[PDB]
Design an enzyme around this catalytic site. Structure first.
Site, PDB file in Angstrom:
ATOM      1  N   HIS A 144       0.844  -1.190   0.000  1.00 20.09           N
ATOM      2  CA  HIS A 144       0.000   0.000   0.000  1.00 20.09           C
ATOM      3  C   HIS A 144       0.880   1.241   0.000  1.00 20.09           C
ATOM      4  O   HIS A 144       0.699   2.165  -0.823  1.00 20.09           O
ATOM      5  CB  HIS A 144      -0.922   0.008   1.219  1.00 20.09           C
ATOM      6  CG  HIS A 144      -1.903  -1.123   1.229  1.00 20.09           C
ATOM      7  ND1 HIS A 144      -2.886  -1.234   2.170  1.00 20.09           N
ATOM      8  CD2 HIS A 144      -2.042  -2.203   0.424  1.00 20.09           C
ATOM      9  CE1 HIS A 144      -3.633  -2.295   1.923  1.00 20.09           C
ATOM     10  NE2 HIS A 144      -3.131  -2.919   0.877  1.00 20.09           N
TER      11      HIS A 144
ATOM     12  N   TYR B 131       1.595   4.562  -3.249  1.00 20.75           N
ATOM     13  CA  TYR B 131       1.561   5.999  -3.284  1.00 20.75           C
ATOM     14  C   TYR B 131       2.820   6.503  -3.970  1.00 20.75           C
ATOM     15  O   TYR B 131       2.763   7.485  -4.729  1.00 20.75           O
ATOM     16  CB  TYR B 131       1.331   6.636  -1.917  1.00 20.75           C
ATOM     17  CG  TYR B 131       0.006   6.254  -1.307  1.00 20.75           C
ATOM     18  CD1 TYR B 131      -1.167   6.770  -1.793  1.00 20.75           C
ATOM     19  CD2 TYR B 131      -0.067   5.355  -0.271  1.00 20.75           C
ATOM     20  CE1 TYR B 131      -2.377   6.412  -1.272  1.00 20.75           C
ATOM     21  CE2 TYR B 131      -1.300   5.015   0.309  1.00 20.75           C
ATOM     22  CZ  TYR B 131      -2.438   5.512  -0.203  1.00 20.75           C
ATOM     23  OH  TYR B 131      -3.679   5.161   0.348  1.00 20.75           O
TER      24      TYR B 131
ATOM     25  N   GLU C 107      -6.999   1.376  10.994  1.00 22.42           N
ATOM     26  CA  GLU C 107      -7.457   0.828   9.703  1.00 22.42           C
ATOM     27  C   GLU C 107      -8.822   1.411   9.266  1.00 22.42           C
ATOM     28  O   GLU C 107      -8.976   1.860   8.094  1.00 22.42           O
ATOM     29  CB  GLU C 107      -7.648  -0.662   9.738  1.00 22.42           C
ATOM     30  CG  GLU C 107      -6.488  -1.585  10.124  1.00 22.42           C
ATOM     31  CD  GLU C 107      -5.631  -1.958   8.962  1.00 22.42           C
ATOM     32  OE1 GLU C 107      -5.922  -1.496   7.786  1.00 22.42           O
ATOM     33  OE2 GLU C 107      -4.683  -2.745   9.200  1.00 22.42           O
TER      34      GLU C 107
ATOM     35  N   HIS D 197      -8.836  -6.021   6.791  1.00 24.39           N
ATOM     36  CA  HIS D 197      -7.985  -5.781   7.938  1.00 24.39           C
ATOM     37  C   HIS D 197      -8.721  -5.318   9.215  1.00 24.39           C
ATOM     38  O   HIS D 197      -8.513  -5.845  10.329  1.00 24.39           O
ATOM     39  CB  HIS D 197      -6.906  -4.745   7.630  1.00 24.39           C
ATOM     40  CG  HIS D 197      -5.961  -5.154   6.552  1.00 24.39           C
ATOM     41  ND1 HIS D 197      -4.920  -4.358   6.151  1.00 24.39           N
ATOM     42  CD2 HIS D 197      -5.863  -6.296   5.828  1.00 24.39           C
ATOM     43  CE1 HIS D 197      -4.286  -4.945   5.146  1.00 24.39           C
ATOM     44  NE2 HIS D 197      -4.819  -6.132   4.946  1.00 24.39           N
TER      45      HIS D 197
HETATM   46 FE    FE Z   1      -2.958  -0.287   4.187  1.00 24.98          FE
HETATM   47 FE    FE Z   2      -4.476  -2.321   6.684  1.00 20.35          FE
END
Ligand code: FE
Ligand code: FE
Ligand code: FE
Ligand code: FE
Lengths: 283, 282
Positions: free
Chosen positions: B97, B101, B154, B191
């Site tokens: 993740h 970016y 999260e 998550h």
């Molecule tokens: Fe993430």
């Molecule tokens: Fe996560």
């Protein structure tokens, strides 16, 4: 204190990017290997041969459980770069994938009773428990470089050594799909051992002469503590099918490889690490 | 002492369903072609570009924290071995993740803009404060509190930063970037769920007095993160006129986080009535 957002547009060591790209580009899951086409050939093994294979695979599963869930993560605090931390999260995940691949092999080929007995053997075997204790003690201790010594010995010595058997079967035209699964694991494990040993060498260059001599001493000590225990583990497993002496040569071959990944010299000369050529093809 | 994992006997099958879903959703940022957003990107003001890069850099920070400290801090507190395996996946995917970016930035932005954004992230006091509140919990010695913090991270902090890419997508701009953010969202939804689920399982193992302490802590931590997030949101979104709506999204996500932990929604529906084009764009 603080965590900085990672910037992959400013690499500090390009090797981190190369290892990321290789490890991630080699992503796999065990369900994609058609192990069910080994059912006929697994039927041709005796109860003793099947037990030996299950036990060896259970021991490997233990080592991957340790490496994913404790080993690779315990290295994260000692990273030289942010990007190394990221690579270590991939290595942790992939050790979990490796551990699960043995359960996929068992689920396809073996009975519940055989599996339960393999897991119980692993809980009680003194040599397997001793090898776990030795690496766990290093991972949980407070000396970063010694932890990378232990990790590289796990990846390049302990692990690599249990790969003898699936390659022995493959070379006799047995369990060829299982062997393909194991070659996916080796393809990761060769990179892990290389990378962690590389980072060890970068760490070593930043310490003084005394610390460096201390680490070479420790490397030899841990190597021969593990090696001694590994020989005893090897004897009890392989004596009856008669493979002990050739596996012991494979252990010496792999010890040299672990040492070299750490930047030390091979210890055993070439004519004492001379493994059956068929085993070497199959990797 | 470490036992070999046996995936043929599961104390909790939920672990294997979550593993199957996360690993089956594997992706890497290079698979999404952001270069088609180059023209769209030229239609933003310098302000709107700055806002987008700052928001992305904050999210990168939280994914760096969650991959490298958060998920791994949860591994000793696992109820099952299979949960520890799942957590290695989550840690990896957080690093993906975070990397994503950087992929967006390298396609669309200049080096000097990237550096400005990373420097803002080092200096901004609300971003540093959110990071320290969760790191303190992750590095502390209270497991259930650590799960509260991780779920709020999260389901509340991250999710809130998804507002902007879904805003742009609702105006038919930066739509490839948006497809990338939807890959992150698909992982984050699982998550937060999973970790909250494990929080609820762990609550049943302590006593009623401890559960009451944890409900207090949850509110207190939420109120602190919320207030810090409002200041962060104000400084980012006030000039473009988005603050009021983002604040509704903060409450909307505060509810999801609370419910992921097994508590009731705090804010009523009339307070979480975020622009419907943003919800649909998720
Ligand atoms: Fe993430
Ligand atoms: Fe996560
Ligand atoms: Fe492995
Ligand atoms: Fe490995």
């Amino acid at each position: 204190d603080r965590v900085s957002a990672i910037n992959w547009n400013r690499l500090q060591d390009e090797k981190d990017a190369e290892v990321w790209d290789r490890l991630t580009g080699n992503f796999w899951l065990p369900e994609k290997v058609p192990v069910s086409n080994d059912i006929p050939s697994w039927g041709t093994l005796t109860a003793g041969e099947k037990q030996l294979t299950m036990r060896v695979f259970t021991g490997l599963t233990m080592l991957d459980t340790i490496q994913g869930t404790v080993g690779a993560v315990s290295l994260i605090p000692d990273a030289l770069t942010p990007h190394e931390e990221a690579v270590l999260t991939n290595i942790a995940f992939m050790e979990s994938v490796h551990a699960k691949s043995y359960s996929q092999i068992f689920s396809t080929l073996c009975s519940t009773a055989e599996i339960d007995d393999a897991f119980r053997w692993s809980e009680e075997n003194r040599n397997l428990q001793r090898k776990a204790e030795i690496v766990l003690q290093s991972y949980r201790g407070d000396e970063p470089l010694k932890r990378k010594v232990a990790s590289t010995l796990l990846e390049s010595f302990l692990f690599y050594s249990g790969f003898y058997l699936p390659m022995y079967w493959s070379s006799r035209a047995k369990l060829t799909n299982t062997a393909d699964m194991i070659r996916l694991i080796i393809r990761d494990e060769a990179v892990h051992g290389y990378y962690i040993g590389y980072k060890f060498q970068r760490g070593l260059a930043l310490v003084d002469d005394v610390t460096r001599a201390e680490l070479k001493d420790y490397t030899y000590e841990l190597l021969f503590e593990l090696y001694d225990n590994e020989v005893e583990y090897t004897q009890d497993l392989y004596d009856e099918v008669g493979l002990t002496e050739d596996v012991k040569k494979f252990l010496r071959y792999n010890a040299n490889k672990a040492l070299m990944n750490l930047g030390y010299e091979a210890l055993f000369p070439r004519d004492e690490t001379d493994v059956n050529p068929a085993i070497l093809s199959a990797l």
